[PDB]
Scaffold this active site. Structure first.
Site, PDB file in Angstrom:
ATOM      1  N   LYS A   6      -8.598  14.268   4.050  1.00  0.00           N
ATOM      2  CA  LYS A   6      -7.838  13.026   4.134  1.00  0.00           C
ATOM      3  C   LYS A   6      -6.932  13.174   5.348  1.00  0.00           C
ATOM      4  O   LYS A   6      -6.859  14.257   5.933  1.00  0.00           O
ATOM      5  CB  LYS A   6      -6.979  12.836   2.886  1.00  0.00           C
ATOM      6  CG  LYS A   6      -5.950  13.948   2.681  1.00  0.00           C
ATOM      7  CD  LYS A   6      -6.186  14.676   1.362  1.00  0.00           C
ATOM      8  CE  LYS A   6      -5.443  14.012   0.219  1.00  0.00           C
ATOM      9  NZ  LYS A   6      -6.368  13.347  -0.735  1.00  0.00           N
ATOM     10  N   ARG A   7      -6.232  12.112   5.723  1.00  0.00           N
ATOM     11  CA  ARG A   7      -5.364  12.208   6.878  1.00  0.00           C
ATOM     12  C   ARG A   7      -4.303  13.267   6.622  1.00  0.00           C
ATOM     13  O   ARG A   7      -3.853  13.443   5.486  1.00  0.00           O
ATOM     14  CB  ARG A   7      -4.720  10.860   7.199  1.00  0.00           C
ATOM     15  CG  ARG A   7      -5.729   9.825   7.681  1.00  0.00           C
ATOM     16  CD  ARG A   7      -6.205  10.111   9.099  1.00  0.00           C
ATOM     17  NE  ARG A   7      -5.090  10.222  10.033  1.00  0.00           N
ATOM     18  CZ  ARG A   7      -4.755   9.277  10.905  1.00  0.00           C
ATOM     19  NH1 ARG A   7      -5.458   8.158  10.964  1.00  0.00           N
ATOM     20  NH2 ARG A   7      -3.724   9.453  11.720  1.00  0.00           N
ATOM     21  N   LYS A  50       0.968  14.515   1.553  1.00  0.00           N
ATOM     22  CA  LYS A  50      -0.314  14.864   0.945  1.00  0.00           C
ATOM     23  C   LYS A  50      -0.356  16.354   0.666  1.00  0.00           C
ATOM     24  O   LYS A  50      -1.262  16.838   0.005  1.00  0.00           O
ATOM     25  CB  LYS A  50      -1.475  14.488   1.857  1.00  0.00           C
ATOM     26  CG  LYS A  50      -1.310  13.143   2.531  1.00  0.00           C
ATOM     27  CD  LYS A  50      -2.159  12.077   1.886  1.00  0.00           C
ATOM     28  CE  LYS A  50      -2.695  11.111   2.926  1.00  0.00           C
ATOM     29  NZ  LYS A  50      -3.552  10.114   2.246  1.00  0.00           N
ATOM     30  N   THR A  94      -8.121   6.920  -2.687  1.00  0.00           N
ATOM     31  CA  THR A  94      -9.489   6.476  -2.982  1.00  0.00           C
ATOM     32  C   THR A  94     -10.481   7.621  -2.816  1.00  0.00           C
ATOM     33  O   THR A  94     -11.596   7.563  -3.334  1.00  0.00           O
ATOM     34  CB  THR A  94      -9.925   5.327  -2.087  1.00  0.00           C
ATOM     35  OG1 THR A  94      -9.339   5.492  -0.794  1.00  0.00           O
ATOM     36  CG2 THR A  94      -9.488   4.013  -2.680  1.00  0.00           C
ATOM     37  N   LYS A 144     -13.921   8.903  -5.009  1.00  0.00           N
ATOM     38  CA  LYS A 144     -15.209   9.243  -4.434  1.00  0.00           C
ATOM     39  C   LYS A 144     -15.697  10.588  -4.998  1.00  0.00           C
ATOM     40  O   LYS A 144     -16.875  10.739  -5.334  1.00  0.00           O
ATOM     41  CB  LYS A 144     -15.104   9.309  -2.910  1.00  0.00           C
ATOM     42  CG  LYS A 144     -14.735   7.990  -2.267  1.00  0.00           C
ATOM     43  CD  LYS A 144     -14.308   8.181  -0.826  1.00  0.00           C
ATOM     44  CE  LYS A 144     -13.455   7.009  -0.364  1.00  0.00           C
ATOM     45  NZ  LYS A 144     -13.188   7.348   1.009  1.00  0.00           N
ATOM     46  N   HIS A 204       0.763  -1.249   0.000  1.00  0.00           N
ATOM     47  CA  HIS A 204       0.000   0.000   0.000  1.00  0.00           C
ATOM     48  C   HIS A 204       0.794   1.299   0.000  1.00  0.00           C
ATOM     49  O   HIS A 204       0.205   2.369  -0.101  1.00  0.00           O
ATOM     50  CB  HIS A 204      -0.955   0.046   1.203  1.00  0.00           C
ATOM     51  CG  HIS A 204      -2.121  -0.893   1.111  1.00  0.00           C
ATOM     52  ND1 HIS A 204      -3.326  -0.532   0.552  1.00  0.00           N
ATOM     53  CD2 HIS A 204      -2.262  -2.176   1.518  1.00  0.00           C
ATOM     54  CE1 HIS A 204      -4.165  -1.552   0.624  1.00  0.00           C
ATOM     55  NE2 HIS A 204      -3.540  -2.567   1.205  1.00  0.00           N
TER      56      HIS A 204
END
Ligand SMILES: O=C(N[C@@H](Cc1ccc(F)cc1)C(=O)N1CCC(O)CC1)c1cc2cc(Cl)ccc2[nH]1
Ligand SMILES: *Cc1c(COP(=O)(O)O)cnc(C)c1O
Length: 830
Positions: free
Chosen positions: A556-557, A562, A664, A668, A365
């Site tokens: 998101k986290r 990110k 992901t 969405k 992952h």
């Protein structure tokens, strides 16, 4: 009302009396003292009643037919609420909506009462939940195996702009969806020592912990299949955890039981980060040890526990069993499968190893090094001494294979070792998983290529046939029909309902791209979704926002990779350009950023404070007015995601190229009518490839440019020197413009950005704001913005987890999916 099913005369009546039966007999309440929470439980039981018949026959069916079983092992299952999802997959939504209406209740108000089953950190955990839903919908005999934490992901609170963590006691009021199966309790061993006697080794003098399973039904979409998610709970044996005599105190002995049970107490809040704590490893072996005995017990019954060749032949083991490893967390399944097969079942090493490799498959992952599991040898040596020996023997035989294949390549040998030398010896769990699995996959095309080209290059050269790709996906049931009934309706009005379990059909929506009515509709549901969220914001959090503005959301986290920070820089830029030319017109924006930071992640927590700090200035500048609002979305979780996503206009997927394996949330947003601004990272590449790059807002460096920069050497000062707008921001952060009382509060962020930015934020700054200007220009043209949206929605069909699962099944597990309705739920009692 919508196509949430039929509201039949007889069924609405039946639902009502059963609701009342439960409020009375189950909740022991009467309409005069029942609280909304009582009403929610009465409904929960009434709906849950409809799947017990199907659950029993599905399990019964798998037993009679005896197909190959798929076991998904994960330490995380981010499920969320389950009332509505159950009504959806059962076609009970409208019926239950009518029934509660008549009982004088608001079903939506009741659904908000259910607690999220937050047994996951983020991407990895939600994927397993989506996969479960898909495996049921595709009629696969699958079981999800994990741990039942009494405390899931912590509840996030913002205090003075800082994140505060508070225990997630989600079981406090009860979980109506779990079924304790005390009768299936299993023993798991820890510590002890190894004894080598005549006919084999023996793991002896171990401490025993009991594993009690709790089953949660997983209903397929309108096909009458109900699979099982089995979560283990730690329980102390009442003997030794009291019987190991000779003083200590009787009271203390009883109190000390919460030591063996602390194993299933709480989920580790780390996302993409490894923490080598003993309690984590214990959870890892706990789920692995119990699940394997359960799998083997089930196998021993099959049709072999009757006749067949007669003789427990584990040769057919891999024909009846497939176990998927979600990351390296359940990696101990490999050496444990060997322990049982070799130490207990008495198989010869090689047959045992052939069987193990043939039943195990591993999913990677991430590629960031700080996420890699490297367990210190002294830990495995004390806790699982026999497993350490097996790992050494596995390593020995594997390196012999390597030496044979690449004679003289002494360096390749040490690089491929499962045992890493150095400060402290460690076991590289990822290397273990590759060696003991018949398949290894990436979660997106780009990530999968990166694995073969970089991280696992030596392994790919040794066994190329092992590496595959399985691009992630999301379930259209929860991520469309459940959270966006409106958009689901207008789509069904035109192309039917068949797309819910065959997302590819969304492509037909392409021929409505010039339809005046459809364009007006797609646009209308988005406006309704935005108005409702805007309302929710003032209702539960209080402080107004303009629903006419563009909804810019990045949820998101919180991670450095990110780049929430890059989003921040753009927000400050907008603010600065407004202050410069106040009376100039700009497209109004509401930028929403949400997500949780791991408690120990200092930088991540500093970023949350920055975000709230920015909003403190921006949201109170009178000159700015309603043209720019910076809002931090508190306690981001699955249930909250179901609210924001359908209301978003712009989805932010701006990770540094090559760092986000797949993602992901990006999928969405695409399915719910948001346009995407992002880098060529993870699944983003395949999404823009499906919609066409003209219908995507791509910017920044590509994997190749990141590497070119790394060869050269990344120097942030250069960008700071050549971009006046960037320099102005950094000087605003350094001088305390955003933290008056504490001028040096953000010195850590500025220091990092300038001297140790692993994710080259500055490198993508210019291209990022330039690209943002383009979306603002397109937003100004409502008709053209909406048509591009339609191009994205109509082209998202490929990212459904049903596709992903059909691929895993066909190319890894060796089973055929089926959309065949199981023979009704019909009563029956044999
Ligand atoms: O939890 C359920 N039933 C109770 C039925 C019940 C209630 C009280 C009692 F003492 C024994 C059994 C139960 O077995 N547990 C209750 C809690 C207890 O600690 C363990 C057993 C349950 C039924 C059921 C049906 C479906 Cl379809 C899905 C989830 C379910 N959970
Ligand atoms: C889908 C989802 C995620 C994953 O988001 P990414 O942007 O891929 O990291 C995380 N948390 C929740 C609540 C989700 O619904």
């Amino acid at each position: 009302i919508s196509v949430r099913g039929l509201a039949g005369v007889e069924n609405v009546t039946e639902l009502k009396k059963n609701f009342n039966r439960h409020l009375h007999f189950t909740l022991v309440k009467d309409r005069n003292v029942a609280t909304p929470r009582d009403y929610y439980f009465a409904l929960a039981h009434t709906v849950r009643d409809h799947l017990v018949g199907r659950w029993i026959r599905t399990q019964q069916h798998y037993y009679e037919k005896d197909p190959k079983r798929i076991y998904y092992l994960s330490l995380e299952f981010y499920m969320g609420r389950t009332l509505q999802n159950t009504m959806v997959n059962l076609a009970l939504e409208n019926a239950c909506d009518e029934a509660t209406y008549q009982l004088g209740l608001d079903m939506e108000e009741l659904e908000e009462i259910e607690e999220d089953a937050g047994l996951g950190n983020g991407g990895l955990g939600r994927l397993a939940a989506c996969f479960l839903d898909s495996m049921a919908t595709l009629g696969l005999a699958a079981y999800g195996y994990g741990i039942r934490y009494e405390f899931g992901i912590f509840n996030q609170k913002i205090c003075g702009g800082w994140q505060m963590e508070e225990a997630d006691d989600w079981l406090r009021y009860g979980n109506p969806w779990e079924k304790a199966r005390p009768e299936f309790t299993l023993p798991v061993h820890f510590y002890g020592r190894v004894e080598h006697t005549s006919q084999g080794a023996k793991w002896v003098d171990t401490q025993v912990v009991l594993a009690m399973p709790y089953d949660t039904p997983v209903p397929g979409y309108r096909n009458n299949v109900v699979n099982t998610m089995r979560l283990w709970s730690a329980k102390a044996p009442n003997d030794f955890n009291l019987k190991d005599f000779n003083v200590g105190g009787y009271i203390q002995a009883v109190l000390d039981r919460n030591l063996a049970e602390n194993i299933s107490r709480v989920l580790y809040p780390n996302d993409n980060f490894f923490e080598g704590k003993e309690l984590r490893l214990k959870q890892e072996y706990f789920v692995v040890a119990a699940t394997l005995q359960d799998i083997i017990r089930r196998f021993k019954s099959s049709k072999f526990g009757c006749r067949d060749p007669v003789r427990t032949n584990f040769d057919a083991f891999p024909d009846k069993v497939a176990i998927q490893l979600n990351d390296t967390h359940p990696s101990l399944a490999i050496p444990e499968l060997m322990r049982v097969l070799v130490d207990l079942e008495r198989l010869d090493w090689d047959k045992a190893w052939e069987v193990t490799v043939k039943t195990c498959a591993y999913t990677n992952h991430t590629v960031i090094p700080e996420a890699l599991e490297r367990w210190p040898v002294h830990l495995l040596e004390t806790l699982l001494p026999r497993h350490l020996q097996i790992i050494y023997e596995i390593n020995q035989r594997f390196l012999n294979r390597v030496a044979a294949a690449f004679p003289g390549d002494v360096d390749r040998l040490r690089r491929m070792s499962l045992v890493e030398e150095g400060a402290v010896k460690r076991i590289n769990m990822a290397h273990l998983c590759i060696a003991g699995s018949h398949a290894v996959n990436g979660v997106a095309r780009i990530h999968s290529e990166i694995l073969k080209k970089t991280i696992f290059k030596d392994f790919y050269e040794l066994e190329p046939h092992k590496f595959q790709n399985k691009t992630n996906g999301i379930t259209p049931r929860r991520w469309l029909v459940l959270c966006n009934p409106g958009l689901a309706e207008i789509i069904a009005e035109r192309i039917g309902e068949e797309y819910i379990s065959d997302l590819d059909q969304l492509r037909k929506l392409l021929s409505y791209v010039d339809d005046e009515a459809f364009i007006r509709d797609v646009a209308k549901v988005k406006q309704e979704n935005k108005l409702k969220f805007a309302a929710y914001l003032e209702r539960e959090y209080k402080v107004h926002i303009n629903p006419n503005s563009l909804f810019d959301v990045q949820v998101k986290r919180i991670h450095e990779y990110k780049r929430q920070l890059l989003n921040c820089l753009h927000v400050i830029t907008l603010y600065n350009r407004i202050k410069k030319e106040p009376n100039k017109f700009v497209v109004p924006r509401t930028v929403m950023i949400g997500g949780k930071a791991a408690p120990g992640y200092h930088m991540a927590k500093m970023i949350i404070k920055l975000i709230t700090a920015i909003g403190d200035v921006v949201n109170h500048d009178p000159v700015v007015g309603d043209r720019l609002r910076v809002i931090f979305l508190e306690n981001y979780r699955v249930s909250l995601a179901e609210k924001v996503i359908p209301a978003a206009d712009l989805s932010e997927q701006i990770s540094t190229a090559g760092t986000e394996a797949s993602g992901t949330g990006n999928m969405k947003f695409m399915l719910n009518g948001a346009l995407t601004i992002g880098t060529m990272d993870g699944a983003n590449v395949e999404m823009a490839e499906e919609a066409g790059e003209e219908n995507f807002f791509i910017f920044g460096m590509r994997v190749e440019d990141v590497d070119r920069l790394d060869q050269r050497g990344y120097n942030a000062q250069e960008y700071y020197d050549r971009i006046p707008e960037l320099r102005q921001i950094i000087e605003q952060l350094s001088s305390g413009f955003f933290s008056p009382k504490q001028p040096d509060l953000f010195k850590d962020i500025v220091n990092m950005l300038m001297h140790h930015d692993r994710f080259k934020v500055f490198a993508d700054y210019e291209e990022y704001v330039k690209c943002q200007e383009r979306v603002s220009a397109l937003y100004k043209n409502p008709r053209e913005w909406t048509r591009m949206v339609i191009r994205n929605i109509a082209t998202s069909g490929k990212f459904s987890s049903d596709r992903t699962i059909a691929q895993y099944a066909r190319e890894i597990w060796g089973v055929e999916p089926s959309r065949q309705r199981l023979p009704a739920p019909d009563e029956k009692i044999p």
